[PDB]
Design a protein around this ligand. Structure first.
Ligand SMILES: [Mg+2]
Lengths: 217, 158, 173
RNA sequence: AGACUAAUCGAACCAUCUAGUAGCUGGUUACCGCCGAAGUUUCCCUCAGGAUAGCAGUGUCGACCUUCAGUUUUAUGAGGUAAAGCGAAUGAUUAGGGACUCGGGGGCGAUUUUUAGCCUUCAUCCAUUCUCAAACUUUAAAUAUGUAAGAAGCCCUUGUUACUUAACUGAACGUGGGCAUUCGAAUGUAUCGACACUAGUGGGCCAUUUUUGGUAAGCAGAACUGGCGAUGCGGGAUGAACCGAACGCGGGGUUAAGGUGCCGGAGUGGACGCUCAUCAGACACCACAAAAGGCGUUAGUACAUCUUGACAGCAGGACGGUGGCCAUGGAAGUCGGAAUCCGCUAAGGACUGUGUAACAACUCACCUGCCGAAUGUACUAGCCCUGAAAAUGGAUGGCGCUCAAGC
RNA sequence: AGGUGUCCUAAGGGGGGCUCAUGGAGAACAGAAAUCUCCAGUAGAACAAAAGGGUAAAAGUCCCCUUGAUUUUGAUUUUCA
RNA sequence: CACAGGGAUAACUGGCUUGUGGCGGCCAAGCGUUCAUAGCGACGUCGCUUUUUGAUCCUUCGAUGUCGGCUCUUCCUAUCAUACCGAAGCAGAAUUCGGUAAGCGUUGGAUUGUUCACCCACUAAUAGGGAACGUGAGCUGGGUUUAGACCGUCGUGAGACAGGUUAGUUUUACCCUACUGAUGAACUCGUCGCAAUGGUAAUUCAGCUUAGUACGAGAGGAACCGCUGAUUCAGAUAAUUGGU
């Protein structure tokens, strides 16, 4: 018997995370955050698409998890279980309260009304801002249409307004396509499991030349 | 709701970061005389002879000197009137103030400018004055030619 | 409003570590030479780290049209704000002076997109040199060979205080 | 039966004490002139009340002292909020990679396994990675805040002491002298200092910004400031709090907020456009409407195609290995699983639907015949439309308005 | 979110020597944990109690001596008239 | 039981809010033999109404008569039946989903003070609501809610119980307005007429024939036209029958 999501939409209180002060909060509904080939190298999936927010509101953990399922279903069917990597980039840490009335409006003992109305935990919710990213997907270059439809269908489970933007970077890295391409050719790039590391020319020679042998020729 | 002698002094009376332990000994070598302008700044590591949290940041006039403490006069603002408070503070919490130092420096030059000018025979123009508006001048464009600007189009960065 | 084109010249105040700073020139449409300077500072604050309290104004002059009795086609590149984002635009006009094009553009944008004067940036204005580089159809129709057209059903003008006419008017003028 | 005791009984009637007391309701009598508030601090068997401080009036006195200031400039101190941070401490938290086996578990090589064997699943270290903190922080604003800007000042010599120093060495208070020619930033001074006696008030409410409890409220509780109360006037049709502006009796001139088709004083004023609604729309606080859709119309972004002849339209074809491999009552392209090749070309898919128990038959993709020029697709936001259901007859103020008297 | 109507002849005062929690590597029974040794170790331990501040040749810790927890009245600070 | 006061303070209407209550949408994993949308809809999300119940205490305490039933008028549509239509996993018949539509109807009884409910029976159908939770100078007084009295539990006792039971006074209209009707001064007295405006009215079913037909393997089984009657409502009349 959860309250309608219209009732918790505007950020009206200071952040209220779980700590040694409020104890006994229910576990957030969503737990998984990565799906697909979450161990693919950076050179396999060079296309990245994001779903960006456009208002300053609250998104509930229940809503986030439901949206996650929708995108996963569509991508698996039309692109294959081994052709994408999806990541959710919004974690719910804000606790919203509730004041029970009728159940707390009993004849025996206690007080009925608005006397002493500090509430009890009732669930968790995520705070988003303008321009914040919610869901990211990386895949090949021939899955443009597939990725776009998945997010467009995903958004119907969130309240508010969101946009879909095709990024200009390479994968999940903060580098533009041309710059990353030419820098890797220069050789100041070392592959890691599902990500990369870069050269910094401030360590000591012996360790740097082992890690990046191709930078010196 | 309580009101103790050190209520709400969590960050004021604390020492800084990477400033702990020994007190620099140059503090104990200064000297004070009545009429000096000092300002109060409490040190958390010394619990004897320390002032209430209100005077942390105020400035006053010494009026008494003792074995290891000085008496300072400061003006408190109660509703609709001022009162003069007389507090005893240990010298570990005080410091000489540079509030009047500019005035003393300026008065010395004023005296000597006036003396020198009287011997020579030209008026003084000694008292200061605020910043007046600028004056006319010329700017050449030789070897510096202007560059044309324009607003930039919109594009997404992420 | 009633606009005019100004060239505005500004500079950073010279200092001991940097005498003779650089000079920046811009072309600004504005009703008078007070809002001209304000627009200059507003556009400069978004490109380079210069205030007005730490800068100075070198010159301000008026640019007049070179041939205000010749008809010519214009193209304008601009950016503006909607209620839910920002966008780029390109429109074309046909008249005799650059200043009027900015006059016409402002009215057209305010009418068709509800875009006030607050939120519009003028990237570039250029008069189309040849005739074959015209793109929009609502002007291609106006440069056809041997143009001519009648004017049917044009009401005659009657004094707004001559009430009670005595015969039926006619619209065949 | 708490019944009856002269129309009176859960304690008769008559006179006196007695004009019994009330922090509680009700009333409180002619005119003009000048000044003009509070619902707040502390205490009370205090919470519908008092004392205390504050706000206010009157009477003056000291000079006309020339001092002052809800302000700015210049010089110099204090702070831990907004923001920011976690490849920085504390706390929360998602994911791979490298190093390791004797840390735990499940296997394999003779489960031999006390084989530092081959696997691996946790756990542990190392370099990285996605998100957070009112009671976390290395950093760190804006607005506000303390002090100073001299004649009661600055410099020179030397008298007093029962204090202090080894000591006329110091510290305070002094005598004498020198430094103004200009007393040492701006602006104002339509209001300087001190004292005496006392009235009312001690239920408050509203608004921009900051903000706490609550689903929310014409709800409850706070900070700086401005208002109503205690206040009329012009505008919002009407309305204590909104906009303009504060008031002796009159004459002339000009405006503010707001308006100029009529009611209604003043434009059926001028320029460029958008909208046709069988529920149009019509001015801040304000008297309401959303998610989602439209080949209604207008403006824009991007990409693809094309006289080697496109999109649309009409007409022709739409073959073989081969009923490919499995699957099973039977499945020959079309229940399902997994594969996804070539020949001939102008062209044809180990297939897009209809269809059979299975075939057959029909059709689509693709190419071709006719024509004579520019199209096709996906997105963005303006007005309009659908979404849009309540009770006496009815309200953009009314009549009415359509290249508007609408935006 | 929590706390008080107590406790202490030392848990007050003075002086003096030492450095902690924990990790690494070793030593008969001894092992995960008993006692001993070396190295590293910015406080991650301790300071009667709730939370915050403060402390390293100490304000902790061990050792030696004591009763400034004494007599006479005044001035000043926070809550505040 | 009493007094001085309070709408600074509760129990009922009215006002703001809509959590809970009721009603309606948007996306589409799936159900539906195959097939998301004939008929439905999880995980999520957007709204509407003031016939439920809450929260607040703005208006009334020198008083606005506080449950239910009886009689009567009118209004709303979120449509039970009646008119005409669009869809189906609509052969016929019986049905289910939707549109224009509030003109016309929506019952008789056993038990309970009941509002609420549950059974019997007829019918085309036995839809949901408002008007100061319509309606007490319109009625009644079964219940709650003064004083008498009995029981059970609690209290030492006086007494308490949103626990059960029995008996308990229901006042005034002639004023103003509103409504139903009836007169009426001014331009001489009369007869015969026109019609601005206001009101408005009809409703449903059954039998025969079409027909044992269309449809269907069978079992079953319609409709328009035509004819004759009947239920509810409205306006008159008294020769016959009955009442007085
Ligand atoms: Mg038959």
């Amino acid at each position: 018997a959860r309250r309608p999501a219209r009732c918790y939409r505007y950020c009206k209180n200071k952040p209220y995370p779980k700590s040694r002060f409020n104890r006994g909060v229910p576990d957030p509904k969503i737990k998984i955050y990565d799906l697909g080939r979450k161990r693919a190298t950076v050179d396999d999936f060079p296309l990245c698409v994001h779903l960006v927010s456009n208002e300053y509101e609250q998104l509930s953990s229940e809503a986030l998890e439901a949206a996650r399922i929708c995108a996963n279903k569509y991508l698996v069917k039309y692109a294959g279980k081994e052709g994408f990597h999806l990541r959710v980039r919004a974690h719910p840490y804000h606790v919203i309260r509730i004041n029970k009335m009728l159940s707390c409006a009993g004849a025996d003992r206690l007080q009925t009304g608005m006397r002493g109305a500090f509430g009890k935990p009732q669930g968790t919710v995520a705070r988003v801002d303008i321009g914040q990213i919610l869901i990211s997907v990386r895949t090949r270059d021939s899955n443009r249409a597939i990725a776009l439809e998945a997010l467009r269908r995903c958004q119907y489970k969130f309240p508010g307004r969101q946009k879909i933007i095709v990024s200009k970077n390479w994968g999940f890295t903060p580098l533009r396509r041309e710059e990353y391409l030419e820098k890797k050719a220069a050789g100041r790039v070392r592959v890691d499991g599902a990500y990369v590391q870069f050269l910094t020319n401030h360590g000591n020679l012996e360790e740097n030349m082992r890690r990046f042998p191709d930078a010196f020729k | 709701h309580a009101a103790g002698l050190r209520s709400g002094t969590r960050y004021a009376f604390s020492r800084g970061f990477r400033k702990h332990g020994q007190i620099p000994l140059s503090t104990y070598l200064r000297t004070y005389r009545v009429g000096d302008i000092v300002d109060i700044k409490v040190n958390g590591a010394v619990q004897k002879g320390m002032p209430h949290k209100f005077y942390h940041g105020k400035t006053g006039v010494v009026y008494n000197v003792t074995k290891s403490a000085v008496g300072v006069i400061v003006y408190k603002r109660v509703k609709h009137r001022y009162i003069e408070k007389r507090i005893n503070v240990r010298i570990e919490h005080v410091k000489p103030s540079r509030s009047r130092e500019d005035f003393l420096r300026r008065v010395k030059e004023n005296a000597e400018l006036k003396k020198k000018a009287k011997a020579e025979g030209v008026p003084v123009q000694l008292k200061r004055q605020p910043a007046m508006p600028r004056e006319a001048h010329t700017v050449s464009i030789a070897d510096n030619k202007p560059v044309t600007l324009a607003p930039v189009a919109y594009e997404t960065t992420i | 409003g009633r606009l005019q084109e100004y060239q505005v010249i500004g500079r950073h105040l010279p200092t001991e570590a940097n005498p003779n700073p650089a000079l920046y020139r811009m072309r600004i449409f504005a009703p008078n030479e007070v809002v001209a300077k304000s627009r200059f500072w507003y556009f400069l604050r978004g490109l380079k780290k210069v205030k007005k309290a730490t800068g100075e104004i070198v010159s301000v002059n008026v640019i007049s049209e070179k041939h205000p009795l010749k008809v010519k086609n214009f193209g304008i590149w601009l950016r503006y704000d909607s209620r839910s984002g920002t966008h780029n635009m390109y429109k074309e006009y046909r008249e005799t002076s650059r200043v009027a094009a900015v006059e016409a553009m402002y009215a057209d944008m305010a009418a068709r997109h509800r875009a006030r004067f607050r939120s519009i940036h003028i990237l570039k204005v250029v008069e189309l040199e040849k005739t074959e580089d015209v793109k929009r159809p609502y002007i291609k129709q106006l440069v056809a060979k041997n143009l001519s057209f009648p004017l049917p059903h044009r009401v005659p003008k009657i004094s707004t205080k001559k009430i009670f006419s005595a015969k039926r008017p006619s619209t065949f003028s």
